[PDB]
Structure formats: C-alpha cells, structure tokens
Amino acid sequence: NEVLALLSRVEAKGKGILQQNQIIAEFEALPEQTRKKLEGGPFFDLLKSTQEAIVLPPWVALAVRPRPGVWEYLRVNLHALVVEELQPAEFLHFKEELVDGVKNGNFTLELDFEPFNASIPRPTLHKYIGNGVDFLNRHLSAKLFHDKESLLPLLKFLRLHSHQGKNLMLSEKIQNLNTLQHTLRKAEEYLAELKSETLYEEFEAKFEEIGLERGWGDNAERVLDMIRLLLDLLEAPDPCTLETFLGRVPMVFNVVILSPHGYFAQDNVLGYPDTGGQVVYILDQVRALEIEMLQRIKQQGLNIKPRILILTRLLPDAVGTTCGERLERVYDSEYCDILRVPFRTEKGIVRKWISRFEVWPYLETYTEDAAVELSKELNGKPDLIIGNYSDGNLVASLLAHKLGVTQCTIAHALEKTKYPDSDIYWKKLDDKYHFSCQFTADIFAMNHTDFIITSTFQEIAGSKETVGQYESHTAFTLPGLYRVVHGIDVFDPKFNIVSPGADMSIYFPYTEEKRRLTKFHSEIEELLYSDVENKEHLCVLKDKKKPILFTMARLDRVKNLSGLVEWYGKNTRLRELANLVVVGGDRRKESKDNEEKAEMKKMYDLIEEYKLNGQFRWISSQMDRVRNGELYRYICDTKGAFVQPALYEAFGLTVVEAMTCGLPTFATCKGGPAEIIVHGKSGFHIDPYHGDQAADTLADFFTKCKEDPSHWDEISKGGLQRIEEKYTWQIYSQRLLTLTGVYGFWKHVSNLDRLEARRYLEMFYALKYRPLAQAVPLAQD
Amino acid sequence: NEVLALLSRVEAKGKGILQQNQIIAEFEALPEQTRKKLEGGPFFDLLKSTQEAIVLPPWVALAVRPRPGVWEYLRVNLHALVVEELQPAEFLHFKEELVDGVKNGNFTLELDFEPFNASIPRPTLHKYIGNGVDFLNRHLSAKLFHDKESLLPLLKFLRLHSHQGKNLMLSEKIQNLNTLQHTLRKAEEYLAELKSETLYEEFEAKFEEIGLERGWGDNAERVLDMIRLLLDLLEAPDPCTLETFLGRVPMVFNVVILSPHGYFAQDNVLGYPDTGGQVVYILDQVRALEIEMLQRIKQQGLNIKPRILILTRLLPDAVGTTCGERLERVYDSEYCDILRVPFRTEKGIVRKWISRFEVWPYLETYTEDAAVELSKELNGKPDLIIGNYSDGNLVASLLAHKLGVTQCTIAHALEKTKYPDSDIYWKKLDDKYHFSCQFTADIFAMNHTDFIITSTFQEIAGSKETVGQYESHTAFTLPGLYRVVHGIDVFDPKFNIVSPGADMSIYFPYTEEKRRLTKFHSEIEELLYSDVENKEHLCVLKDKKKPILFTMARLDRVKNLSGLVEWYGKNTRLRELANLVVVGGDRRKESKDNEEKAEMKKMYDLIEEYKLNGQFRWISSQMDRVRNGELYRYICDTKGAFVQPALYEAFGLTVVEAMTCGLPTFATCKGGPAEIIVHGKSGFHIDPYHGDQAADTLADFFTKCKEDPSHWDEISKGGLQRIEEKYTWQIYSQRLLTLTGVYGFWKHVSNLDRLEARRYLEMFYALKYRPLAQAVPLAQD
Numbered sequence A, B: 001n002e003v004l005a006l007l008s009r010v011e012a013k014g015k016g017i018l019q020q021n022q023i024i025a026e027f028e029a030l031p032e033q034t035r036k037k038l039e040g041g042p043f044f045d046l047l048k049s050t051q052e053a054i055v056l057p058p059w060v061a062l063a064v065r066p067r068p069g070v071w072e073y074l075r076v077n078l079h080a081l082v083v084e085e086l087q088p089a090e091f092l093h094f095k096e097e098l099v100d101g102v103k104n105g106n107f108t109l110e111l112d113f114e115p116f117n118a119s120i121p122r123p124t125l126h127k128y129i130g131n132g133v134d135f136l137n138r139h140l141s142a143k144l145f146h147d148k149e150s151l152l153p154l155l156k157f158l159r160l161h162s163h164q165g166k167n168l169m170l171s172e173k174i175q176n177l178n179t180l181q182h183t184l185r186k187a188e189e190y191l192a193e194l195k196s197e198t199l200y201e202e203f204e205a206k207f208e209e210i211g212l213e214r215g216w217g218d219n220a221e222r223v224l225d226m227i228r229l230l231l232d233l234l235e236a237p238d239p240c241t242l243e244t245f246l247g248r249v250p251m252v253f254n255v256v257i258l259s260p261h262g263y264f265a266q267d268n269v270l271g272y273p274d275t276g277g278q279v280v281y282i283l284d285q286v287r288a289l290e291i292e293m294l295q296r297i298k299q300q301g302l303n304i305k306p307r308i309l310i311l312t313r314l315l316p317d318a319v320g321t322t323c324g325e326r327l328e329r330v331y332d333s334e335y336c337d338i339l340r341v342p343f344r345t346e347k348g349i350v351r352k353w354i355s356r357f358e359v360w361p362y363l364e365t366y367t368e369d370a371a372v373e374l375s376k377e378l379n380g381k382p383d384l385i386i387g388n389y390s391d392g393n394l395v396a397s398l399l400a401h402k403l404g405v406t407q408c409t410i411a412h413a414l415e416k417t418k419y420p421d422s423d424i425y426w427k428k429l430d431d432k433y434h435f436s437c438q439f440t441a442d443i444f445a446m447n448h449t450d451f452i453i454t455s456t457f458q459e460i461a462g463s464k465e466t467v468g469q470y471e472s473h474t475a476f477t478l479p480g481l482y483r484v485v486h487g488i489d490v491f492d493p494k495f496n497i498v499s500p501g502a503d504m505s506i507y508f509p510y511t512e513e514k515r516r517l518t519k520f521h522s523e524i525e526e527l528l529y530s531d532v533e534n535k536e537h538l539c540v541l542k543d544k545k546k547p548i549l550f551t552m553a554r555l556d557r558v559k560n561l562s563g564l565v566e567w568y569g570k571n572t573r574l575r576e577l578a579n580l581v582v583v584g585g586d587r588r589k590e591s592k593d594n595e596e597k598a599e600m601k602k603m604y605d606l607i608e609e610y611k612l613n614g615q616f617r618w619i620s621s622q623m624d625r626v627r628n629g630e631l632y633r634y635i636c637d638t639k640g641a642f643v644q645p646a647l648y649e650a651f652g653l654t655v656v657e658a659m660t661c662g663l664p665t666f667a668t669c670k671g672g673p674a675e676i677i678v679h680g681k682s683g684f685h686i687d688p689y690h691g692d693q694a695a696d697t698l699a700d701f702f703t704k705c706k707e708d709p710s711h712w713d714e715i716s717k718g719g720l721q722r723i724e725e726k727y728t729w730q731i732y733s734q735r736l737l738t739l740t741g742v743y744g745f746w747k748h749v750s751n752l753d754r755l756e757a758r759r760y761l762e763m764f765y766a767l768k769y770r771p772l773a774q775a776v777p778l779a780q781d
C-alpha cells in the first residue's frame, strides 16, 4: 500500500506544526480522502489506535495504543518510507521541542517509577485492571504456601495487633508457628464442642491461657470459622481464604479523611466554587463506613467505639456556613466528625477562601497543624488515612508517612484530563492554574499511597477507543520542568474500582408516591415557573406544561453549562419541545472565582443573543440535597430529562442521582459517565464537542416520547436498574475495609522493597514539590 | 559506679554547647581529669573510641567507632545514668540543633543510599575494604555456577563486544550456551595439536567459520589458555579464573580522564593555585596506562591504536603556559593527549582562571562541550572514563551516563576532611568555598561511579583509632540543606586500593653518582645559598654548610606552611642544627587565590617576627619536575630532611618523592602519610596540631645524626625500601585494566538492580546539584 499510505501522511503535512489528536487526526486525514481509503487492510486499521501524533517538519511522531494500558510510540517520515520505533522519552522529546523549540536540558529531570514498583509481578490481563486486590491476593496466597520466612510476617502481625492498649488476636505467649499451629488446633478441638451461640466471654478465660486475645469473633460459631480460616493459611493458602481472613481481622477503628479545599459543610455550600461532588461523596462515604465498622467491631466481639475525622480548612470569614467551627458532627452518625484546621503563615492564620488551584504553599504547614489536632481528637493513631483530590492526597501522603498509617487515595478528578494539553502548555497556564504544583502532587500521591480507589474502570484504563484518566499519566511531559517516562501504570495491583452511589433516602424513584416530599412543591414551583427575576433565578418560563430539560452543577468552564445553553439557544426543534432549566452559579453574591465569573458573563450574553427569555430559567446554587431530590423527581413529573454537557466529567454524581429518581439522562461521553450510562438502554451519550448533534439527539428523544410515551418509561427503567446493579453504597464500605486488611498486611511483607521507592518520593516531594509550592503567591487578607 | 561517669560528664558540660573531637574528647575529660580516672575497664576502653561528641546542655551525643566501618551512636544524660541508643538520623538531629538551633525541617531531605546498595551482599570483613574486586569475583563466580540465566550475560557480553566496526571474541554465529560450549570444545581440540608459537593468522580462517573472532590471543598457546578459561567458567566457575579471564579480554582502547580545574600542563604550572599532585598523578598515570594497553592489545593479537585524552579547561589568558591550546601531546608518549575545552556561558567563552571552589556553575555546559570535542578526537566511543577530584568526578559521571561507559573515580582529596566541621558549619563557609555544591558533587559521583580507586587504605577506612576520608561521608548533615544518613559504606565492593608512585626517571636515590644531574648545581646553589632577595627567593642562608630542612608544596591554609615556619622560628635548638628552606607560592606575580594571599602575608610577618633572615630561605614555585628531582638529592647532600606539616594530607606525593630520593621524611600524621610511613623505620610522623613538639622531634633527629651520622642513612635506606615495596607505577596499570574488565562486565549482570539507584541519582543531580551550582556567582571578565 505504498501508494495509499503515502496519501495519508500527505494530507497530514499541510496541517502544519501542531498537536494531532485522534479526532483532529485522521477525521481530517481519512474522511477527507477519496475512495482510495479502501484501508480495511492493516495501515489505516491498526493505527486507528493512534491517540495523538506530533506534527513537525520531515518527521511526525505518533503514540499508538493497541489495547488499554499498552502503548508503542513511532516516528514516520513526513515524506519517506521509513518508520523508526521511538522510546517513551524520545517521543516526549518531540512534544518538548514543539513548544520550547528545543528538548529539555539533557540532565534536566526524568521521573521513572517503573523500577521502583518491581515488587509484585504486573498482571497483563485487561480483566485485572481496577481489580488489583484480587491479584495481590493470588500473589500472597502463592508466596505464603509452605514458606516459613513468609508466614512469620502474618504471625508477627497478629501478635503486634492492638488498639487503645488492648491486645487482639494472638498474645505474646505465641512465639512461633509451631505454638500458634498447636494452639489454634487446640482451640478448635475445644470450640467444635460448644453450642454455636456461646459468647466469647465464656471461653475467654481458657483462650487467654493458651494465648488467644479478643477479636476472633463474638461467639463460638464465629470464632470457630475464623480459627479454621487461619489454620488454613498456615496449611494450604488460597486467595479467597486469605482475603476473607485479612478482611475480617478487626483493624479499622479510627479513620482520617482529607478534604482541605472548598467550603466543606453539610449546608449552604453545594454549588460554591470547588464545592460539589467531592463533598457529597465524602459525607455519604463516612456514614456508610461507620455503619460497617460498628458492625465488624461487634461481630468480632469488641467494644471499641470508632471515630472518623474529615480534615479540612477552617474558614473563619465564610458566613452563612459552619465552615468557621473546628468540630462538627456529621448528620445521621454518632462517630463521624468534621475537623477544621486553619491555613497559616509566619504572620498568623489566613482567613479568606482560597481557590483549590492556589492552596499549594499552605499544605505542608497545614499537614503539621492537622497532625497535632487530629492527634488530640483520636484515642490511638489513625488506622486508615484516605486522601481526596490533590491537596487531599498530598496532605494524606505526608501524614501517612509521618504517622506510618495505611494510606488510600481517591482522585475525584485529575486536572490533566480536564484541561486538554495543560501538561504541554502548562507554562502559560501557570500564573493562573499552578498545574506544575498540582501534577507534581498528583504524581507523588499516586505513587505514594498503598491503594487507590476509583469510581469506574474508565477512570483508570479508559476504553478500547479512548484513554483513561490515570492512564494519561503514564507518560507525559511538562516542557522546561521535567519529563515523566513512566509515571503510573494502568495494571498496578494497587488500583481498585469501588463505585459510589446516591443517598437512597434522598434519591428514590419519582413514582413512589407516599415518599414524595410534597411540602416542597410550592417552593419548587416558584423556583421554576414564577415570573420574578432576581439573584435566585433569571428569566422566566412562558409555558408551564412543557417537559423540562434540566441540569444542575458547579459553574465553571469545564462544566460547560454555557455550551449547553448555546446548543439549546440555536435549536428551534428542541426549544419548542422542552424548557431549559440550568442550575449553576450563586448570583446572590459577587463571585470570587475566575471561571465562574467568566462563565456567568457568557450566560448573560447568551440569554440576550438567542433571545432565551421564556424558554429558559437560570437558577442559582441549590444547596439542600433533600429538596434537591424532590427537584429531580419533579422534573420526571414533567417527563423531562437530565443533561450533563461537560467537556470532561471525571465521574458525575449528578448523573447517578438523576437516574435513581427515574430521570432519563443524556451525559457527556468524555469521562466517567461513558461507563455509567449504557447507550440507548440506561440513558444516552452526547458529545460536548458536537453540540448541535447533542441538541438534536435530545429533540429526537422528546419527539419520540411525544408519539410514544412508553419510550420515556423505558429509559427511566433502564436507568433505575443500571443503578441498582453498579452504583450503591452497600457493597462500598465492606470492599473498602477488606482492602485496608489486604493492603495493610501487604505493607509488612512488601516492606523492604518499598524502601527505595520511599526515598525517591521523599526526595521528589522535598526537591521538586516544596520549591514549586513556595513559588505560588500567598493570599493577602 | 555512677559517681565517676557523672564526673567526666559534668567535666564535659563546662565546655558548653559544641562539637568535641576525640582530640579534645579524651584530652579535656580523662587525664586532664583528676586521678579519680582510674578507669581502664568498661566505658573507658570502648568509649576512648568515641570519634566526636555533640554537647547539648542536658545531653551529650556520642559517635562510637569500635572497628573501622562500624558505628554506634549514643545519647547520655549530661547528668544521669541514662544511656540510650541513637539511630544515625537521631544523632544527626543533634548536630543540627547545635547550629541552626532547631533540627532540619520535618519534611526536609534525607539522603539514604543503603536501600539502593542492597543489590550485592555487604562484606563485613576488614580484609575486603579496598579489596572489593576480590569480593565481587567470588560473588560472580558463585552466581555464575551452573546458572543459565546467569551465564547468558557473559555470552551476550562477548557476542556484542566490538571495536571500531570490527567484531571481537564471539561472532553472531553463537546464539546459545550449547553452541558456544560446543564451539569452544572444537577450538580447544584443534589448537591443542598446533605448535604453541603458531600465529593467530594461521587458524583465523578456521576460527571465523565456527564463530570465533579475534582477541583471544596473538598465538595458539595464548588462545588455548583463553578458550580453556571460558570453558572452565561455563563448567565450574572459580573467582581466580573469572578474574583472569575478564582482566585479559581486550576492552580498554580509548580512555578519557577528567581534570577541569587548575592550570593543567606539563611545564610552568606546578605550584600555582589548584595545580599540584593531581596533575603529577595523572601525567605519570597515563604514561603507564598507555604502555600496558599497548602490551595487552598486542598479546591478544590486535592492531588497534589506543588513545588517552585528558579533558581539562582551556585558559586563554594564562601566559607562560600552554593552557590556551586545545590539543597537547603528553611528554614521552605516542598516544596520550591533553584536550582542552573552554568554559562558557550564554555571553560566550569565559577567559579567566577560576578557583576550584567556584567552577560549579560551568560544569554542565563543560560536559556537553567535552562530549562533542572528545567525540571528534576519539575513533569509537570511550571505553573507560576516569573522573578526578570533585569537578572531575561530577563531569565524569555525567559523561559516563550520557555515553554508556564504565566509570571510575579518583578523589585525590575530599574537602570535608581537609576543612574540619565544614559540613556542619557549611552555611558560613559557603560564600567563600561553596561546599554545599562540592559535598553534593562528591556524594553523587561517589555513588554514581562503577568502581573507586584510592591511594591508601586510610583514604577509605582510616585506622583503628581514626576515621577515614570516605568513611567520614557515611553519615553527616549540612543543617538547613539536607542530611546524609547513609552516604557511603567503606565495605562497599566498589573500593579498590591501587597505590601510585613517583616517576623513577625523575626521582632516584641521591647515592647514584652516575645519574646525578650536575648541570643544575649552579642554579640550585644560587637558589638556596645566594645573596639576592626578590620574587624568586626571600631572606638569606648565612651558613651554607648546615643541613637543610626542606619542604615543597602549593601555598594554602591546610598545607600549613606558615605553621612549619612558625614552629621553626620559635625553636632555637632547631634553628642552630638546620636551615629551613620552604618552597611555596609564586611571588613572581600578584596572587589571585584567597588562601595563597592570606598565607603569604603570614609568611612575611613570620619572617619579621622570628627574625628569620640568615636561617630561612623562602623560594617560589618550582615548576620543572626534572630539576626538582635534583633539588631533593641536593638536600640529601646537606644530610637534611623533608617535612610535611599539613593539617591534613589526603595522600602526599612529595612524601613519596622525598623518600624515593632517599631523603629522610617527617610527615603529618593526619592523612595518607599516616599509612605511607612506618614511624622510626621508613620515616617519622609529626602532629601538625603540636608543632612545638614537631620542631623538637626534628631537633632530636638532627642531634642524633651528628653523634651518629649513620642514623640518617638508616632512615634513608628505610624510606627507600618502603617505596620499592608499597608505592610504584608498575602494577598500577595492570590492575586498573583488570578492574575495568571485571566491573565492566559486572555492570551488565547487575544492570537491572542498579536501575532504581540510577534514577535516584539522576533526580539528585537534577534537583540538588543543578540548583546549587547555579547559585554560585559567575566569573566576570
């Protein structure tokens, strides 16, 4: 095909010196090409997998991705027959040259985390992505099988295990596998005799004699299965046994959760800058976590009272909010509190809200302050530390290091994918977004943590056609700063997919009448349909009978609300069928946020340009989740739909909330919602990059729904069952806890290999992050 | 006996907050202590081995050193019986409180190389320090024994191995151990029948066909020993065989040696600032090396022409010298050239000489520039790269990385031992000396290199009583910068002692009349005994018939010549017995160097203070080694002595020079000269810290020599033998080449494990050295 293949690069040439993405790629090349396309041979086809290609003079470089998590880079001659296979670094060189004009100084930093991971083998099966604990178990199960030097670690573990000055599992009486083996067998013979429901307290005395401390279970039956479980790990370890035992051992009692940025609170917040899905997730998480812990604790026959602290910034000048108080009990829980610590410098505490992009210079000092405070509140040290987002993961990493605690991170979003080419173009973005800091923190926490939780597969490995969020951090470069050769690997056994949900008593199907909160209908109707225009709501709905196209979200550039508004403004077919109600931004107060401010000015203009008055209602931030639920269900009444038009959406809780209430959802294909929604079944995908087709798809739906109302009900059911299956909080907590067990034990076995990695990070943090963070200007009060 | 320990303890407090070296440690407390000492026993015996004590009001910190390379740190209450065991970091914590007032920032950097060096096991025996290649051999020999995965590296090594386009050893025809085991078997059988003296050209045809390329030997006898060796490695590897095979394989053809600082030349230099032994060491070295390479290349049946390039700086404005010319042929060699590259910045070439303490900002660009130039001179890339000193090892590490070459380093001195407490006190020393740059380069190069060469065992592990030059780098801290927890380990298998010598054509026994160069006797006599005072010589020797107490060196603080002069001045008994002749500094010109200037003023005042005219002759730098040779022998004629009063001397070539000419020698006891000399047998040690005692020691020797002139001869003959035994250039080259063979191969077996350390080291150059090096103010023409 030397004729045909020439013809492609040919088209590529004129395109000039620039970034070739996939769409921006052959979508130009192939579809602008004649019947000569005829490419169903290898060249077009296998290289339909080109993720991006670097356009320069006689060479063009391109990154290819046959399968998720598998990359190969190539350099093909602009005019020539030659293709030479590039190394990751060589490829990244191109990107550097394209911006600065030259590559990075030869001796300028190159991060390679590859050699530091080598402890466990790396699974190559797509199946094991986001499944690592499964993999880790098979590795431990196999390494444990008849190996002395291997088993000791497990015995040392149970012997050292204690909480608040009480011994658990094995006592000091057991010095070796022989006594342990002998004692367990000795215990088993005894217990197999007793009535199943016999309380531990009965056989406690004897158990203390032979070296068994509390926590095996609350009764004979339970203690029995457990002793039988461990005896088995000593004898013939299998992965399922190993997990079950480790997950059962009472461990997690105290938990520390990190969420520094935003206005973190239970009221009067949601919709403010940086306040949103993260805050929601965390409050649901702790409540779900606390129920599971009280249980595991009670089943294991212990009386410890758990504690969960959520750490965040104390903001003294936020008014209307509880953000200025140090300690706050979380709704519907006994043991979960929000702990607030202030940011400070040499000159004293900093009062004013700071954007999440600007917090960096404060975090290290924050970390120390937090350690002191959370130490005051906890009886015992943290049994698990979970970081959230970047600041959260950064701080949680420093703390876990400092307190030697099992650490888990949860990204909630990765900015590198929200802001396209923000890595290569970072320099000009930097005075505003400080991405050099963020990406640094992101890499550091990502490799520092023990395990990683994600809400979907796509967060990790993306899909067959497109690349996942974490995966996009495998190899990248920030020209002038440093180059990341292997930053992360999609196959890492630390990745674990644990899907969240929507609080089921906030969000239920709109069709359950007795449950509908009808006291909210008066206000909901003023909200939507009233003729008043003010800071709460702008414009007016001229027609109250139409279905409502609805969206609710934080207002910023990536949420792309102004985009939706344009698509709708322009589409008369859609405008005639539905009213557009957009909730975003708080216009009650002058916005302090750059993007929100910008985004708001667009909304105003679009109102004027498309003469949107009468079909459009623009609603400020809706902060009560409880009424929020009813809002969703109310839209169902009108037979409307939810739309999520983000340019990228990391997960999309609102998409999960809508589906739970029975509201048919059209959500962006870029990011998490691609995995949540099964197209034509659980909802529909739209592409924010083709807005007019999104608008038309919506129109198609309402049109079909008009002629056949069963169509609406179909998707509503599809959505409801799709949540029932994938997204709920019941499985979450347990999975999370089991993980703490397996990854905690793993710490001790894998201990000494992570020493090298522990220094690389320590040094990366110190020599790279700190100086960058310090560079970021301080806020002035 | 807590009444006693508390005695010495409170004895120590009176000193206050500060450092105490063993000098002071047992000096002040203990025998300067009241006879209540009566110690012996425990707590004296072992803790007389205390190396340093950090004194903070409630506590004292103790670095304890039972055996070379073995360290224990202890905190003990200034008042109390309490003695706790500090881990190294904890002890480093102390020193930091002593200076900054607080310990280093919690998240401030700890350099730890230990976890990276875990690749090979650690020898614990005193006998392997500086013997590392011996240990590596037995390790490789075992790992190699019936290991397919182990043997393959060797086959690959031999297969890929080539030079200048020509294939060596194995050809591509041998892909596996069986084929090779088979080919070698045919080969031995064939050659076995042949006449030993048969040339390789005869069987060259036969060999090529079975896959055997050149380099096994010049004739059949040599080739047969060689093929047998390999057969034996594949069958039953032993260390001695391994060493012999690897040492013998032709490898080193192009050698590159880095020495950027100083005025490096063959004439009109020695004695200038920064120009000294390192220049002598190298010139002597390369000449020996070339001779050996020529030999080896021939024995293996090769026609390759070697090249040895000494990279150093090109100095356009040094007049009276050749420093301004790019390429210079080394005296009395066919293949060794000095290659000069200029320092430069954006503004163009930097003309002026820069002190070795200031070259840091220019080193990276130098590396880039050098790579190009040497690549223009060398035919084929460098086979071995040898760094010298700090700038030299720094640059040589960058090149080695860049071009993929076996690297060796030679320190020639380590500033941290020469400038005591410069690590802990660095910040105040930095504007002047920039030790925050140099200590960084040292740590880096020292861990980056493949193998390290030293001139003595003291350079590495010191003695029973005192710490070594490298060993002092194991644990230290630069408060406010970083903290090296494990920075080096004297048992590290990379250490190899290979002792240098004096050019035997330049320096020989003064008793060989035939050889004495008499045509210099006129100059020498004007130089010593002349009536004239000028830039060339100061004061006057009133009596030409006395013995001369001679010394020669660069003029700087540590060389401590102003002290020798003072000791001499105070001592009337010594002044009567001998004339003091000191060579140092060049007064022909205004002086650019700080210490040299400082040191000259001291010299002047001293001459006036002690009325040194008539006893003392202060001569300027003597830059022609050949006449220097005679001058030594002339001092022998007067029946005098050589004295080396350094506060610290890393090695001391002039000591070896003096001894070799048969001039009895008194050398400092702090440094290499401690090992070079056997007190009373090959010369005498003097303590630069007690000079009044040193002057008296000299007085004694000169007195004894009057009553019994044969005393002199005894030491002279003594020193001579000591040299013919321990220090000469014959074995040096042979050993260097063998180490290059083994470590070269060793790097392929160990390549994978070193990968982490590779990255950690890269990150350190990039985020620590680079920034520091840029902070150094540029030379401005």
Ligand SMILES: O=c1ccn([C@@H]2O[C@H](COP(=O)(O)OP(=O)(O)O)[C@@H](O)[C@H]2O)c(=O)[nH]1
Pocket (backbone or CB within 6 Å): A270, A271, A275, A276, A277, A278, A280, A552, A553, A554, A583, A584, A620, A621, A622, A623, A624, A625, A628, A651, A652, A653, A654, A655, A657
């Ligand atoms: O004015 C608002 C804006 C957002 N939310 C809630 O904030 C979350 C938005 O999270 P999502 O994951 O959808 O987007 P994110 O904020 O995480 O980027 C959802 O629970 C919304 O219901 C809200 O209650 N009121």
Ligand SMILES: O=c1ccn([C@@H]2O[C@H](COP(=O)(O)OP(=O)(O)O)[C@@H](O)[C@H]2O)c(=O)[nH]1
Pocket (backbone or CB within 6 Å): B270, B271, B275, B276, B277, B278, B280, B552, B553, B554, B583, B584, B585, B620, B621, B622, B623, B624, B625, B628, B651, B652, B653, B654, B655, B657
């Ligand atoms: O005025 C001088 C001073 C020194 N040297 C030579 O320089 C070297 C000094 O080497 P050494 O190791 O003793 O001291 P270094 O300068 O290396 O620290 C010796 O060869 C000396 O003979 C010299 O030729 N003329």
Ligand SMILES: OC[C@H]1O[C@](O)(CO)[C@@H](O)[C@@H]1O
Pocket (backbone or CB within 6 Å): A262, A274, A275, A276, A277, A278, A279, A356, A389, A411, A412, A413
């Ligand atoms: O990136 C999305 C943003 O919204 C949040 O979910 C906060 O509610 C955070 O993850 C981040 O500030």
Ligand SMILES: OC[C@H]1O[C@](O)(CO)[C@@H](O)[C@@H]1O
Pocket (backbone or CB within 6 Å): B262, B274, B275, B276, B277, B278, B279, B356, B389, B411, B412, B413
């Ligand atoms: O500290 C020793 C100094 O003298 C030299 O030997 C002469 O080049 C170098 O090693 C260094 O400048």
Ligand SMILES: [K+]
Pocket (backbone or CB within 6 Å): A157, A158, A159, A160, A161, A162, A167, A168, A169, A170, A171, A213
């Ligand atoms: K226990």
Ligand SMILES: [K+]
Pocket (backbone or CB within 6 Å): B158, B159, B160, B161, B162, B167, B168, B169, B170, B171, B213
């Ligand atoms: K070869």
